[PDB]
Design an enzyme around this catalytic site. Structure first.
Site, PDB file in Angstrom:
ATOM      1  N   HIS A 281       8.155   6.010  -0.933  1.00  0.00           N
ATOM      2  CA  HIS A 281       7.959   5.974  -2.383  1.00  0.00           C
ATOM      3  C   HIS A 281       7.217   7.213  -2.840  1.00  0.00           C
ATOM      4  CE1 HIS A 281       8.361   1.303  -2.475  1.00  0.00           C
ATOM      5  NE2 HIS A 281       9.511   1.937  -2.395  1.00  0.00           N
TER       6      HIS A 281
ATOM      7  N   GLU B  79      11.491  -2.356   1.145  1.00  0.00           N
ATOM      8  CA  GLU B  79      11.256  -3.235   0.000  1.00  0.00           C
ATOM      9  C   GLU B  79      12.576  -3.527  -0.723  1.00  0.00           C
ATOM     10  OE1 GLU B  79       7.591  -1.691  -2.071  1.00  0.00           O
ATOM     11  OE2 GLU B  79       6.818  -3.418  -0.939  1.00  0.00           O
TER      12      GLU B  79
ATOM     13  N   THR C 233       5.362  -2.470  -6.861  1.00  0.00           N
ATOM     14  CA  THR C 233       5.659  -3.513  -5.859  1.00  0.00           C
ATOM     15  C   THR C 233       4.407  -4.100  -5.211  1.00  0.00           C
ATOM     16  OG1 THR C 233       5.858  -2.034  -3.953  1.00  0.00           O
ATOM     17  CG2 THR C 233       7.867  -2.412  -5.277  1.00  0.00           C
TER      18      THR C 233
ATOM     19  N   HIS D  66       3.794   7.365  -0.409  1.00  0.00           N
ATOM     20  CA  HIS D  66       3.403   6.432   0.629  1.00  0.00           C
ATOM     21  C   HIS D  66       4.654   5.761   1.173  1.00  0.00           C
ATOM     22  CE1 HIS D  66       3.706   4.016  -3.049  1.00  0.00           C
ATOM     23  NE2 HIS D  66       4.157   3.082  -2.231  1.00  0.00           N
TER      24      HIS D  66
ATOM     25  N   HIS E 145      -3.731  -0.975   2.526  1.00  0.00           N
ATOM     26  CA  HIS E 145      -2.385  -1.557   2.319  1.00  0.00           C
ATOM     27  C   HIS E 145      -1.290  -0.630   2.822  1.00  0.00           C
ATOM     28  CE1 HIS E 145      -4.862  -3.862  -0.447  1.00  0.00           C
ATOM     29  NE2 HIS E 145      -5.331  -2.659  -0.731  1.00  0.00           N
TER      30      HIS E 145
ATOM     31  N   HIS F 292       6.307   1.915   3.081  1.00  0.00           N
ATOM     32  CA  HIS F 292       6.233   0.521   3.488  1.00  0.00           C
ATOM     33  C   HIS F 292       7.075   0.403   4.755  1.00  0.00           C
ATOM     34  CE1 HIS F 292       4.751  -0.607  -0.608  1.00  0.00           C
ATOM     35  NE2 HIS F 292       5.461   0.465  -0.910  1.00  0.00           N
TER      36      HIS F 292
HETATM   37  N1  4WA Z   1      -5.566   0.198 -11.749  1.00  0.00           N
HETATM   38  C1  4WA Z   1      -4.509   0.397 -10.814  1.00  0.00           C
HETATM   39  C2  4WA Z   1      -4.666   0.021  -9.471  1.00  0.00           C
HETATM   40  C3  4WA Z   1      -3.621   0.217  -8.549  1.00  0.00           C
HETATM   41  C4  4WA Z   1      -2.403   0.816  -8.933  1.00  0.00           C
HETATM   42  N2  4WA Z   1      -1.426   0.949  -7.989  1.00  0.00           N
HETATM   43  N3  4WA Z   1      -0.431   1.887  -8.056  1.00  0.00           N
HETATM   44  C5  4WA Z   1       0.671   1.808  -7.234  1.00  0.00           C
HETATM   45  C6  4WA Z   1       1.574   2.884  -7.288  1.00  0.00           C
HETATM   46  C7  4WA Z   1       2.882   2.729  -6.792  1.00  0.00           C
HETATM   47  C8  4WA Z   1       3.233   1.534  -6.147  1.00  0.00           C
HETATM   48  S1  4WA Z   1       4.914   1.333  -5.629  1.00  0.00           S
HETATM   49  N4  4WA Z   1       4.723   0.485  -4.281  1.00  0.00           N
HETATM   50  O1  4WA Z   1       5.492   2.642  -5.433  1.00  0.00           O
HETATM   51  O2  4WA Z   1       5.590   0.468  -6.550  1.00  0.00           O
HETATM   52  C9  4WA Z   1       2.393   0.407  -6.248  1.00  0.00           C
HETATM   53  C10 4WA Z   1       1.108   0.559  -6.781  1.00  0.00           C
HETATM   54  C11 4WA Z   1      -2.247   1.168 -10.290  1.00  0.00           C
HETATM   55  C12 4WA Z   1      -3.295   0.967 -11.214  1.00  0.00           C
HETATM   56 ZN    ZN Z   2       5.410   1.614  -2.643  1.00  0.00          ZN
END
Ligand code: 4WA
Ligand code: ZN
Ligand code: 4WA
Length: 257
Positions: free
Chosen positions: A116, A103, A195, A91, A61, A93
């Site tokens: 992020h 985003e 997100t 990371h 992703h 986007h």
């Molecule tokens: N079990 C599990 C699986 C995936 C997870 N993902 N963590 C992420 C961490 C940060 C972002 S974001 N794009 O920074 O909001 C989005 C997802 C979190 C917990």
């Molecule tokens: Zn992110």
């Protein structure tokens, strides 16, 4: 199976993750005229001097630069936050064109990309517990515009050839995330969510007003990554952003007059 295509993208996510239509979803449009200066916000403290990067991973992703979070080495404090939040990964986007990819938006303006930096609240002991709490995470968001090159991004750009496809990782030690920050720490803040799935409503968002500039050549190298695994049909990793979600019953606060 979720992704960013026509058949598995943001409009489909709610069917497996019903919180997609929840009350504090991210990202959002930041209406700069409606956001209000908050005098109760304390100074923001980004303390990354002892950061220990470990590895870079293509997860299908985006790509994550991962950090050693077993001690208080790289932390975020102050601002809207109570207590200490530890850096776990960053990371990006980004878009298929320079006119899209962020985003969050600012008065409906889309930037070329968004960085992020993901942190977890140490009161919860680890990331896995923290991500299930309403004050579990703090994500520092930084907009990227296309202009002059960002020197401190180049070490990331140059390793991307070694993690082209989903599931590939590479060593990535001694990277200093301080080289990805703008001069000003002026910010907007609001309560939101992850997100991407699982879209958990556990994030205090801190979005910097000042974008960083990266070169067209730098963002072009982001766009050469693949969503697919090795030996599968090539699908370029582009437009891995969720669009702005309804603000609902939330106020965006500004750190600056
Ligand atoms: N079990 C599990 C699986 C995936 C997870 N993902 N963590 C992420 C961490 C940060 C972002 S974001 N794009 O920074 O909001 C989005 C997802 C979190 C917990
Ligand atoms: Zn992110
Ligand atoms: N195909 C499918 C398309 C949508 C997803 S979901 N609801 O986005 O996780 C799952 C499989």
């Amino acid at each position: 199976h979720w992704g960013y295509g026509k058949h598995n993208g943001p409009e489909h996510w709610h069917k497996d993750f019903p919180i997609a239509k929840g009350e504090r979803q991210s990202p959002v449009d930041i209406d700069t005229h409606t956001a209000k200066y908050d005098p109760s916000l304390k100074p923001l403290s980004v303390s990354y001097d002892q950061a220990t990067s470990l590895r870079i991973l293509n997860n299908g992703h985006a790509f994550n630069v991962e950090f050693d979070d077993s001690q208080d080495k790289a932390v975020l404090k102050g601002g809207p936050l109570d207590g200490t939040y530890r850096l776990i990964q960053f990371h990006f986007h980004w878009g298929s064109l320079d006119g899209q990819g962020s985003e969050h938006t600012v008065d409906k303006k889309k930037y070329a990309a968004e960085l992020h930096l993901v942190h977890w609240n140490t009161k919860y002991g680890d990331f896995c517990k923290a991500v299930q709490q309403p004050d579990g995470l703090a994500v520092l968001g930084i907009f990227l515009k296309v202009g002059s090159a960002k020197p401190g991004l180049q070490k990331v750009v140059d390793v991307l050839d070694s993690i082209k496809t989903k599931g590939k990782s590479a060593d990535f030690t001694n990277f200093d995330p301080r080289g990805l920050l703008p001069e000003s720490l002026d910010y907007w803040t609001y309560p939101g969510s992850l997100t991407t799935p699982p879209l958990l409503e556990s994030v205090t968002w801190i979005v910097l007003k000042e974008p960083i500039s990266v070169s067209s050549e730098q963002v072009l190298k982001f766009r050469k990554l693949n969503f697919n695994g090795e030996g599968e049909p090539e699908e370029l990793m582009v437009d891995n952003w969720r669009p702005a979600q309804p603000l609902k019953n939330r106020q965006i606060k500004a750190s600056f007059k």
